[model samples]
Target: PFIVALDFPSKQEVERFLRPFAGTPLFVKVGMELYYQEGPAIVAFLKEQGHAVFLDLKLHDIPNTVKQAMKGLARVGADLVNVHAAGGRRMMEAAIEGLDAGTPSGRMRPRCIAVTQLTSTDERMLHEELWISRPLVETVAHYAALAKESGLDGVVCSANEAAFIKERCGASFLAVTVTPRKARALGSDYIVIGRSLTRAADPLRTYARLQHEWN
Candidate 1:
């Protein structure tokens, strides 16, 4: 999937940025920053415009709190939802429970995934900051396995790790890789492109080229 990260600060900015792609189908990720700024109205508007939504708040908290928050989030009509895998199995399972419970009568619950490690985090940071002694890929793989056992549909990992994750997690498991390098596409199920398109001199042209190359 070609996922666009809508990392804008406000609804009007998002609107202005996306206007050129009006009526085109899209899969968009709404991170905590944008969601907090514009709220559910932005999600509703995206759905109305025929785009698939990935609400990327990376929910992490006590199981009950995350569950309750996911219950409300499920009602927002996202196609996918995610939580931090470090939150543990019960929290991830509770998220699925909340999604199932909050889904409308006829609609299926959104697919739930986990954030294994952020793209910005490197081995040094993993060891020094998080105190994880394992190799970076190993840590990510372990987290992906834990998330799978917790019944999450997939994970968010760096593009470089996508093949490794697929090897361990199976080909069908979704891998959403963020900020991939231009020289290689990591065969992830979803490639999330952000500022490269949104901040370009001509976003529409850049997006078109990315779409073509990504496909």
Candidate 2:
């Protein structure tokens, strides 16, 4: 299943939505809001209900600091985590080192992905409004390559570039693309979309369409 973004700000609010999916091999992302409000306790709560988590903090910092931060994140036992590609190679490397050390015996390492760019950003908004002159796709490709080289598991780029990035970086490279158009399936094992199923009038039909793209 495509990853679901769990965006509640409180435990009770999240539970309201989560109740229906209990005891299933559910994959859900805990963004900044719920994470800040509940911390790892929320993870434990979900685990109790048999849900796997995708911790989407998108951390960015100095090498040493980020390394320490990842140590704590790894302890959360999330299936996936994210860092900012703009933090550069050293910082992402440090994160990998820290997280690797936290892996338990017989347990898999948490897959770390880099945020190439936010889906909210468009070309003109980045160049004209933000005064950044680089092409959006180029910037994303550059950072995705850098993060992969730095030993990151993958990157959070638009699915528009998934085939390109995966082709260059290797198809196995994890590309967590998120979008809103046509089931948002650009080619990612982990694609995040909101309105497609969350608010869709026909969520089942929308989800079926999304699944068909991969087939």
Candidate 3:
């Protein structure tokens, strides 16, 4: 799915932004800025609007804390959620445990993915700053492997790293990020488009174009 990142800070802004696209069930993201400002109720409201939500909190913390937070997020009704892969295997496992526990009796739990590295991090920073001796590509590969081992459905990574991760993790362990139609063909299970749609002069048209690109 090509998800739109809804970065507005308040409900009114979101309401205005989504007004033109009300008839369709758009796959959208509720990032930290929006979620922190409006609380989880924003997710509830989006779900009510017939939109599928991706709660992009990117949680990272002690296992119990992450677990509890994820459990709470599960109740808020997002279709997908994510954690930082650097948070370690135990933490990712706890995140899934919490998701499974909070999910309603028969409903499927939200799909959980791990963030390998921020999209901007590169080789120099990986070695000099992060203090990791490994190269950037190897770092991401290892993290991708760790995420799969931890029981996550997939991982959040740069488009460049998608194929690399898929090679080892296989087709089922998702690598999200993309170029619409090309993204799917190239193996990006999902992609997030922010300003491209949100800042367009006519977002509805832009969205329709994106739908065409995605298909």
**Clash totals, every prediction:** 0, 0, 0
lDDT of each: 0.85, 0.78, 0.88
Please give me the total number of clashing residue pairs in predicted model 2. Answer: 0
Candidate 2: residue pairs that collide: none
Error of 1 at 97 (Å): 0.7
How would you encode candidate 2's per-residue C-alpha lDDT over 58-106 as one tens digit per residue? Answer: 8989999888888888887687888998889999999998787778868
Per-residue accuracy of model 1 over 62-153 as CA lDDT, tens digit each: 99999888899888888999999989999999999999888988878999989998878888999999998999889889999989988899
Superposition error at 76 for model 2 (Å): 1.6
What lDDT, from 0 to 1, does candidate 1 have?
0.85
Give the Å shift of residue 38 in candidate 2.
Answer: 1.2
Span of 10 residues, lowest total lDDT, candidate 2:
178-187
Error of 1 at 19 (Å): 1.4
Better of 1 and 3 by TM-score: 3
Quote the lDDT for 6 in model 3. Answer: 91
Global CA lDDT computed for model 3:
0.88
CA lDDT, candidate 1, residue 203:
76
Best by TM-score: 3
Lowest-sum lDDT 10-residue window in model 1: 178-187
lDDT by residue (81-194, candidate 3, tens digit) is: 999989999999999999998898888999999988788888888888999898888889899999999999999877767888999999889877836877777778888898
